[PDB]
PDB file of all heavy atoms in Angstrom:
ATOM      1  N   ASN A   1     103.648  65.814 119.754  1.00 35.09           N
ATOM      2  CA  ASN A   1     103.044  65.470 118.486  1.00 35.09           C
ATOM      3  C   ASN A   1     103.374  66.418 117.344  1.00 35.09           C
ATOM      4  O   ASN A   1     103.670  66.054 116.160  1.00 35.09           O
ATOM      5  CB  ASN A   1     101.502  65.433 118.611  1.00 35.09           C
ATOM      6  CG  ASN A   1     101.085  64.153 119.352  1.00 35.09           C
ATOM      7  OD1 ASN A   1     101.487  63.070 118.925  1.00 35.09           O
ATOM      8  ND2 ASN A   1     100.178  64.223 120.364  1.00 35.09           N
ATOM      9  N   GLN A   2     103.303  67.709 117.668  1.00 35.99           N
ATOM     10  CA  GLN A   2     103.624  68.700 116.666  1.00 35.99           C
ATOM     11  C   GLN A   2     105.049  68.577 116.229  1.00 35.99           C
ATOM     12  O   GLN A   2     105.302  68.751 115.058  1.00 35.99           O
ATOM     13  CB  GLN A   2     103.523  70.210 117.127  1.00 35.99           C
ATOM     14  CG  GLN A   2     102.030  70.503 117.314  1.00 35.99           C
ATOM     15  CD  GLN A   2     101.728  71.721 118.135  1.00 35.99           C
ATOM     16  OE1 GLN A   2     100.564  72.028 118.285  1.00 35.99           O
ATOM     17  NE2 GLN A   2     102.724  72.465 118.572  1.00 35.99           N
ATOM     18  N   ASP A   3     105.990  68.395 117.193  1.00 34.82           N
ATOM     19  CA  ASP A   3     107.411  68.267 116.822  1.00 34.82           C
ATOM     20  C   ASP A   3     107.730  67.020 115.963  1.00 34.82           C
ATOM     21  O   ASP A   3     108.538  67.110 115.042  1.00 34.82           O
ATOM     22  CB  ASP A   3     108.343  68.298 118.043  1.00 34.82           C
ATOM     23  CG  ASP A   3     108.265  69.604 118.763  1.00 34.82           C
ATOM     24  OD1 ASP A   3     107.955  70.607 118.197  1.00 34.82           O
ATOM     25  OD2 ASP A   3     108.582  69.551 119.998  1.00 34.82           O
ATOM     26  N   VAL A   4     107.073  65.888 116.218  1.00 37.47           N
ATOM     27  CA  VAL A   4     107.335  64.717 115.434  1.00 37.47           C
ATOM     28  C   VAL A   4     106.854  64.940 114.028  1.00 37.47           C
ATOM     29  O   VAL A   4     107.555  64.733 113.010  1.00 37.47           O
ATOM     30  CB  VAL A   4     106.725  63.481 116.090  1.00 37.47           C
ATOM     31  CG1 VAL A   4     106.852  62.305 115.136  1.00 37.47           C
ATOM     32  CG2 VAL A   4     107.516  63.060 117.364  1.00 37.47           C
ATOM     33  N   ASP A   5     105.627  65.449 113.969  1.00 39.25           N
ATOM     34  CA  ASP A   5     105.073  65.752 112.652  1.00 39.25           C
ATOM     35  C   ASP A   5     105.957  66.663 111.775  1.00 39.25           C
ATOM     36  O   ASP A   5     106.257  66.460 110.540  1.00 39.25           O
ATOM     37  CB  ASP A   5     103.643  66.270 112.858  1.00 39.25           C
ATOM     38  CG  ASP A   5     102.839  66.310 111.573  1.00 39.25           C
ATOM     39  OD1 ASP A   5     102.701  65.215 110.913  1.00 39.25           O
ATOM     40  OD2 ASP A   5     102.428  67.321 111.137  1.00 39.25           O
ATOM     41  N   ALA A   6     106.384  67.747 112.408  1.00 38.20           N
ATOM     42  CA  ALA A   6     107.241  68.705 111.776  1.00 38.20           C
ATOM     43  C   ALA A   6     108.537  68.059 111.312  1.00 38.20           C
ATOM     44  O   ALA A   6     109.037  68.365 110.214  1.00 38.20           O
ATOM     45  CB  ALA A   6     107.551  69.905 112.719  1.00 38.20           C
ATOM     46  N   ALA A   7     109.082  67.142 112.123  1.00 36.13           N
ATOM     47  CA  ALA A   7     110.324  66.438 111.780  1.00 36.13           C
ATOM     48  C   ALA A   7     110.149  65.614 110.503  1.00 36.13           C
ATOM     49  O   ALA A   7     110.939  65.764 109.604  1.00 36.13           O
ATOM     50  CB  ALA A   7     110.909  65.597 112.917  1.00 36.13           C
ATOM     51  N   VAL A   8     109.096  64.813 110.444  1.00 35.06           N
ATOM     52  CA  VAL A   8     108.826  64.027 109.229  1.00 35.06           C
ATOM     53  C   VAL A   8     108.648  64.934 108.042  1.00 35.06           C
ATOM     54  O   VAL A   8     109.220  64.711 106.964  1.00 35.06           O
ATOM     55  CB  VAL A   8     107.516  63.279 109.411  1.00 35.06           C
ATOM     56  CG1 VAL A   8     107.361  62.369 108.196  1.00 35.06           C
ATOM     57  CG2 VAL A   8     107.786  62.365 110.572  1.00 35.06           C
ATOM     58  N   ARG A   9     107.814  65.948 108.235  1.00 34.06           N
ATOM     59  CA  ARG A   9     107.604  66.821 107.152  1.00 34.06           C
ATOM     60  C   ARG A   9     108.855  67.517 106.704  1.00 34.06           C
ATOM     61  O   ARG A   9     109.070  67.684 105.519  1.00 34.06           O
ATOM     62  CB  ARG A   9     106.358  67.698 107.279  1.00 34.06           C
ATOM     63  CG  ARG A   9     105.366  67.136 106.252  1.00 34.06           C
ATOM     64  CD  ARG A   9     104.145  66.734 107.017  1.00 34.06           C
ATOM     65  NE  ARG A   9     104.245  67.576 108.183  1.00 34.06           N
ATOM     66  CZ  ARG A   9     103.484  68.626 108.418  1.00 34.06           C
ATOM     67  NH1 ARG A   9     102.467  68.926 107.578  1.00 34.06           N
ATOM     68  NH2 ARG A   9     103.769  69.348 109.537  1.00 34.06           N
ATOM     69  N   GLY A  10     109.718  67.913 107.620  1.00 33.24           N
ATOM     70  CA  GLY A  10     110.940  68.547 107.182  1.00 33.24           C
ATOM     71  C   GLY A  10     111.828  67.608 106.328  1.00 33.24           C
ATOM     72  O   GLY A  10     112.513  67.985 105.395  1.00 33.24           O
ATOM     73  N   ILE A  11     111.915  66.362 106.723  1.00 33.88           N
ATOM     74  CA  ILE A  11     112.704  65.393 105.985  1.00 33.88           C
ATOM     75  C   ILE A  11     112.178  65.254 104.562  1.00 33.88           C
ATOM     76  O   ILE A  11     112.916  65.291 103.591  1.00 33.88           O
ATOM     77  CB  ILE A  11     112.551  63.982 106.631  1.00 33.88           C
ATOM     78  CG1 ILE A  11     113.376  63.948 107.938  1.00 33.88           C
ATOM     79  CG2 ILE A  11     113.042  62.891 105.656  1.00 33.88           C
ATOM     80  CD1 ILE A  11     113.210  62.641 108.755  1.00 33.88           C
ATOM     81  N   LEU A  12     110.844  65.079 104.471  1.00 34.50           N
ATOM     82  CA  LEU A  12     110.237  64.862 103.165  1.00 34.50           C
ATOM     83  C   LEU A  12     110.353  66.083 102.309  1.00 34.50           C
ATOM     84  O   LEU A  12     110.261  65.994 101.128  1.00 34.50           O
ATOM     85  CB  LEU A  12     108.793  64.426 103.315  1.00 34.50           C
ATOM     86  CG  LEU A  12     108.705  63.123 104.097  1.00 34.50           C
ATOM     87  CD1 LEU A  12     107.227  62.809 104.224  1.00 34.50           C
ATOM     88  CD2 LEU A  12     109.350  61.967 103.323  1.00 34.50           C
ATOM     89  N   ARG A  13     110.567  67.243 102.880  1.00 34.25           N
ATOM     90  CA  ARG A  13     110.731  68.400 102.011  1.00 34.25           C
ATOM     91  C   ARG A  13     112.237  68.664 101.761  1.00 34.25           C
ATOM     92  O   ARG A  13     112.571  69.585 100.988  1.00 34.25           O
ATOM     93  CB  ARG A  13     110.245  69.726 102.665  1.00 34.25           C
ATOM     94  CG  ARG A  13     108.767  70.020 102.981  1.00 34.25           C
ATOM     95  CD  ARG A  13     108.801  70.798 104.316  1.00 34.25           C
ATOM     96  NE  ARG A  13     107.705  71.673 104.741  1.00 34.25           N
ATOM     97  CZ  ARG A  13     107.916  72.425 105.851  1.00 34.25           C
ATOM     98  NH1 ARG A  13     109.104  72.322 106.475  1.00 34.25           N
ATOM     99  NH2 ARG A  13     107.007  73.279 106.346  1.00 34.25           N
ATOM    100  N   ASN A  14     113.154  67.959 102.466  1.00 35.06           N
ATOM    101  CA  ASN A  14     114.547  68.275 102.287  1.00 35.06           C
ATOM    102  C   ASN A  14     115.143  67.436 101.164  1.00 35.06           C
ATOM    103  O   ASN A  14     115.051  66.202 101.126  1.00 35.06           O
ATOM    104  CB  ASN A  14     115.331  68.123 103.605  1.00 35.06           C
ATOM    105  CG  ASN A  14     116.748  68.544 103.389  1.00 35.06           C
ATOM    106  OD1 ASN A  14     117.481  68.022 102.525  1.00 35.06           O
ATOM    107  ND2 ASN A  14     117.123  69.559 104.138  1.00 35.06           N
ATOM    108  N   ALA A  15     115.764  68.152 100.236  1.00 33.79           N
ATOM    109  CA  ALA A  15     116.410  67.553  99.075  1.00 33.79           C
ATOM    110  C   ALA A  15     117.494  66.512  99.404  1.00 33.79           C
ATOM    111  O   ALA A  15     117.634  65.500  98.711  1.00 33.79           O
ATOM    112  CB  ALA A  15     117.002  68.633  98.167  1.00 33.79           C
ATOM    113  N   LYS A  16     118.281  66.771 100.429  1.00 31.72           N
ATOM    114  CA  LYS A  16     119.326  65.865 100.813  1.00 31.72           C
ATOM    115  C   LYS A  16     118.733  64.727 101.602  1.00 31.72           C
ATOM    116  O   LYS A  16     119.139  63.602 101.501  1.00 31.72           O
ATOM    117  CB  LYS A  16     120.304  66.593 101.706  1.00 31.72           C
ATOM    118  CG  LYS A  16     121.433  67.303 100.950  1.00 31.72           C
ATOM    119  CD  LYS A  16     122.703  66.407 100.734  1.00 31.72           C
ATOM    120  CE  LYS A  16     123.493  65.960 102.011  1.00 31.72           C
ATOM    121  NZ  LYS A  16     123.432  64.514 102.414  1.00 31.72           N
ATOM    122  N   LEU A  17     117.731  65.040 102.383  1.00 31.89           N
ATOM    123  CA  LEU A  17     117.148  64.005 103.227  1.00 31.89           C
ATOM    124  C   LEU A  17     116.116  63.017 102.667  1.00 31.89           C
ATOM    125  O   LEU A  17     116.059  61.819 102.963  1.00 31.89           O
ATOM    126  CB  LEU A  17     116.612  64.614 104.549  1.00 31.89           C
ATOM    127  CG  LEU A  17     117.619  65.333 105.429  1.00 31.89           C
ATOM    128  CD1 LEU A  17     116.873  65.855 106.663  1.00 31.89           C
ATOM    129  CD2 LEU A  17     118.826  64.482 105.813  1.00 31.89           C
ATOM    130  N   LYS A  18     115.230  63.531 101.887  1.00 34.08           N
ATOM    131  CA  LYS A  18     114.169  62.696 101.430  1.00 34.08           C
ATOM    132  C   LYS A  18     114.525  61.388 100.779  1.00 34.08           C
ATOM    133  O   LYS A  18     113.907  60.364 100.986  1.00 34.08           O
ATOM    134  CB  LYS A  18     113.386  63.582 100.489  1.00 34.08           C
ATOM    135  CG  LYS A  18     112.137  62.775 100.099  1.00 34.08           C
ATOM    136  CD  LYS A  18     111.229  63.528  99.144  1.00 34.08           C
ATOM    137  CE  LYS A  18     109.967  62.707  98.910  1.00 34.08           C
ATOM    138  NZ  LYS A  18     110.156  61.899  97.720  1.00 34.08           N
ATOM    139  N   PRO A  19     115.495  61.458  99.904  1.00 33.78           N
ATOM    140  CA  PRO A  19     115.907  60.305  99.187  1.00 33.78           C
ATOM    141  C   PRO A  19     116.473  59.317 100.123  1.00 33.78           C
ATOM    142  O   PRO A  19     116.275  58.142  99.916  1.00 33.78           O
ATOM    143  CB  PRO A  19     116.966  60.678  98.160  1.00 33.78           C
ATOM    144  CG  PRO A  19     117.336  62.081  98.514  1.00 33.78           C
ATOM    145  CD  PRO A  19     116.251  62.601  99.463  1.00 33.78           C
ATOM    146  N   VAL A  20     117.098  59.764 101.169  1.00 32.69           N
ATOM    147  CA  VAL A  20     117.598  58.767 102.114  1.00 32.69           C
ATOM    148  C   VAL A  20     116.471  58.054 102.805  1.00 32.69           C
ATOM    149  O   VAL A  20     116.389  56.854 102.948  1.00 32.69           O
ATOM    150  CB  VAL A  20     118.519  59.396 103.182  1.00 32.69           C
ATOM    151  CG1 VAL A  20     119.147  58.335 104.127  1.00 32.69           C
ATOM    152  CG2 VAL A  20     119.550  60.265 102.440  1.00 32.69           C
ATOM    153  N   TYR A  21     115.663  58.833 103.369  1.00 32.31           N
ATOM    154  CA  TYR A  21     114.517  58.310 104.086  1.00 32.31           C
ATOM    155  C   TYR A  21     113.697  57.395 103.186  1.00 32.31           C
ATOM    156  O   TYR A  21     113.290  56.266 103.550  1.00 32.31           O
ATOM    157  CB  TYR A  21     113.672  59.568 104.314  1.00 32.31           C
ATOM    158  CG  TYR A  21     112.460  59.260 105.157  1.00 32.31           C
ATOM    159  CD1 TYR A  21     112.601  59.237 106.543  1.00 32.31           C
ATOM    160  CD2 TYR A  21     111.244  58.960 104.542  1.00 32.31           C
ATOM    161  CE1 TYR A  21     111.470  59.007 107.328  1.00 32.31           C
ATOM    162  CE2 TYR A  21     110.121  58.681 105.316  1.00 32.31           C
ATOM    163  CZ  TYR A  21     110.253  58.737 106.712  1.00 32.31           C
ATOM    164  OH  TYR A  21     109.208  58.466 107.532  1.00 32.31           O
ATOM    165  N   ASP A  22     113.490  57.848 101.939  1.00 34.90           N
ATOM    166  CA  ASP A  22     112.698  56.951 101.030  1.00 34.90           C
ATOM    167  C   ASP A  22     113.344  55.596 100.835  1.00 34.90           C
ATOM    168  O   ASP A  22     112.687  54.576 100.628  1.00 34.90           O
ATOM    169  CB  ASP A  22     112.520  57.579  99.641  1.00 34.90           C
ATOM    170  CG  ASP A  22     111.457  58.651  99.611  1.00 34.90           C
ATOM    171  OD1 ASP A  22     110.649  58.649 100.643  1.00 34.90           O
ATOM    172  OD2 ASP A  22     111.454  59.475  98.753  1.00 34.90           O
ATOM    173  N   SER A  23     114.672  55.545 100.891  1.00 36.70           N
ATOM    174  CA  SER A  23     115.315  54.245 100.673  1.00 36.70           C
ATOM    175  C   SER A  23     115.338  53.310 101.838  1.00 36.70           C
ATOM    176  O   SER A  23     115.673  52.083 101.691  1.00 36.70           O
ATOM    177  CB  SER A  23     116.755  54.511 100.266  1.00 36.70           C
ATOM    178  OG  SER A  23     117.475  54.988 101.429  1.00 36.70           O
ATOM    179  N   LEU A  24     115.031  53.853 103.006  1.00 40.13           N
ATOM    180  CA  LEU A  24     115.119  53.009 104.188  1.00 40.13           C
ATOM    181  C   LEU A  24     113.914  52.214 104.549  1.00 40.13           C
ATOM    182  O   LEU A  24     112.797  52.581 104.167  1.00 40.13           O
ATOM    183  CB  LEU A  24     115.340  53.888 105.469  1.00 40.13           C
ATOM    184  CG  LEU A  24     116.710  54.694 105.400  1.00 40.13           C
ATOM    185  CD1 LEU A  24     116.839  55.801 106.495  1.00 40.13           C
ATOM    186  CD2 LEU A  24     117.889  53.723 105.525  1.00 40.13           C
ATOM    187  N   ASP A  25     114.158  51.162 105.341  1.00 42.47           N
ATOM    188  CA  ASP A  25     113.108  50.355 105.933  1.00 42.47           C
ATOM    189  C   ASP A  25     112.516  51.171 107.142  1.00 42.47           C
ATOM    190  O   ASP A  25     113.041  52.192 107.625  1.00 42.47           O
ATOM    191  CB  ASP A  25     113.652  49.006 106.482  1.00 42.47           C
ATOM    192  CG  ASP A  25     114.690  49.243 107.555  1.00 42.47           C
ATOM    193  OD1 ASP A  25     115.849  49.397 107.019  1.00 42.47           O
ATOM    194  OD2 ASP A  25     114.495  49.318 108.750  1.00 42.47           O
ATOM    195  N   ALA A  26     111.375  50.708 107.684  1.00 44.54           N
ATOM    196  CA  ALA A  26     110.688  51.384 108.770  1.00 44.54           C
ATOM    197  C   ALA A  26     111.426  51.711 110.053  1.00 44.54           C
ATOM    198  O   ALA A  26     111.319  52.848 110.601  1.00 44.54           O
ATOM    199  CB  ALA A  26     109.261  50.829 108.997  1.00 44.54           C
ATOM    200  N   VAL A  27     112.160  50.734 110.563  1.00 43.30           N
ATOM    201  CA  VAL A  27     112.901  50.965 111.769  1.00 43.30           C
ATOM    202  C   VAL A  27     113.921  52.023 111.521  1.00 43.30           C
ATOM    203  O   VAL A  27     114.153  52.966 112.278  1.00 43.30           O
ATOM    204  CB  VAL A  27     113.521  49.637 112.200  1.00 43.30           C
ATOM    205  CG1 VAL A  27     114.395  49.801 113.433  1.00 43.30           C
ATOM    206  CG2 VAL A  27     112.302  48.830 112.586  1.00 43.30           C
ATOM    207  N   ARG A  28     114.661  51.841 110.422  1.00 42.99           N
ATOM    208  CA  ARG A  28     115.712  52.867 110.190  1.00 42.99           C
ATOM    209  C   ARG A  28     115.189  54.269 109.957  1.00 42.99           C
ATOM    210  O   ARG A  28     115.830  55.261 110.229  1.00 42.99           O
ATOM    211  CB  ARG A  28     116.759  52.414 109.114  1.00 42.99           C
ATOM    212  CG  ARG A  28     117.554  51.159 109.531  1.00 42.99           C
ATOM    213  CD  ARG A  28     118.555  50.778 108.435  1.00 42.99           C
ATOM    214  NE  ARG A  28     119.465  49.708 108.841  1.00 42.99           N
ATOM    215  CZ  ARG A  28     119.197  48.399 108.609  1.00 42.99           C
ATOM    216  NH1 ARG A  28     118.060  47.980 108.098  1.00 42.99           N
ATOM    217  NH2 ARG A  28     120.079  47.451 108.971  1.00 42.99           N
ATOM    218  N   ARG A  29     114.015  54.358 109.348  1.00 43.93           N
ATOM    219  CA  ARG A  29     113.431  55.710 109.110  1.00 43.93           C
ATOM    220  C   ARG A  29     113.216  56.377 110.491  1.00 43.93           C
ATOM    221  O   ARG A  29     113.407  57.596 110.612  1.00 43.93           O
ATOM    222  CB  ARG A  29     112.055  55.481 108.478  1.00 43.93           C
ATOM    223  CG  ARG A  29     112.168  55.378 106.976  1.00 43.93           C
ATOM    224  CD  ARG A  29     110.818  55.029 106.338  1.00 43.93           C
ATOM    225  NE  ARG A  29     111.106  54.804 104.920  1.00 43.93           N
ATOM    226  CZ  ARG A  29     110.225  54.599 103.958  1.00 43.93           C
ATOM    227  NH1 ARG A  29     108.982  54.598 104.277  1.00 43.93           N
ATOM    228  NH2 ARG A  29     110.569  54.363 102.661  1.00 43.93           N
ATOM    229  N   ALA A  30     112.850  55.538 111.510  1.00 44.37           N
ATOM    230  CA  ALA A  30     112.660  56.116 112.815  1.00 44.37           C
ATOM    231  C   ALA A  30     114.009  56.610 113.319  1.00 44.37           C
ATOM    232  O   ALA A  30     114.057  57.660 113.991  1.00 44.37           O
ATOM    233  CB  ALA A  30     112.146  55.053 113.788  1.00 44.37           C
ATOM    234  N   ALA A  31     115.072  55.872 113.038  1.00 46.18           N
ATOM    235  CA  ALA A  31     116.393  56.384 113.501  1.00 46.18           C
ATOM    236  C   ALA A  31     116.698  57.754 112.874  1.00 46.18           C
ATOM    237  O   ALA A  31     117.254  58.661 113.530  1.00 46.18           O
ATOM    238  CB  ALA A  31     117.565  55.415 113.267  1.00 46.18           C
ATOM    239  N   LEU A  32     116.326  57.940 111.623  1.00 42.26           N
ATOM    240  CA  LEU A  32     116.582  59.218 110.950  1.00 42.26           C
ATOM    241  C   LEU A  32     115.736  60.341 111.534  1.00 42.26           C
ATOM    242  O   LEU A  32     116.186  61.477 111.733  1.00 42.26           O
ATOM    243  CB  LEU A  32     116.458  59.064 109.372  1.00 42.26           C
ATOM    244  CG  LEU A  32     116.643  60.307 108.565  1.00 42.26           C
ATOM    245  CD1 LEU A  32     118.115  60.571 108.566  1.00 42.26           C
ATOM    246  CD2 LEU A  32     116.221  60.043 107.126  1.00 42.26           C
ATOM    247  N   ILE A  33     114.469  59.987 111.820  1.00 42.60           N
ATOM    248  CA  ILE A  33     113.642  61.009 112.408  1.00 42.60           C
ATOM    249  C   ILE A  33     114.232  61.470 113.747  1.00 42.60           C
ATOM    250  O   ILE A  33     114.340  62.684 114.076  1.00 42.60           O
ATOM    251  CB  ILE A  33     112.210  60.464 112.569  1.00 42.60           C
ATOM    252  CG1 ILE A  33     111.610  60.025 111.202  1.00 42.60           C
ATOM    253  CG2 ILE A  33     111.287  61.444 113.386  1.00 42.60           C
ATOM    254  CD1 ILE A  33     110.207  59.369 111.323  1.00 42.60           C
TER     255      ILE A  33
END
């Protein structure tokens, strides 16, 4: 649980990553995580 949480949070704080994740649909966001 802690690792998944940390993964999402890291993406949302990453400049290169966030915008990608924000553009994706739900299934694909899971692929990124």
Side-chain angles (χ1 to χ4, degrees):
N1 285 306
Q2 290 162 178
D3 297 333
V4 172
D5 194 57
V8 186
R9 252 121 24 107
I11 285 175
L12 300 178
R13 292 143 158 188
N14 184 303
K16 271 270 295 110
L17 301 180
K18 186 180 185 266
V20 184
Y21 185 83
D22 282 344
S23 71
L24 298 168
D25 60 274
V27 177
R28 297 180 172 92
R29 272 175 187 187
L32 178 76
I33 301 176

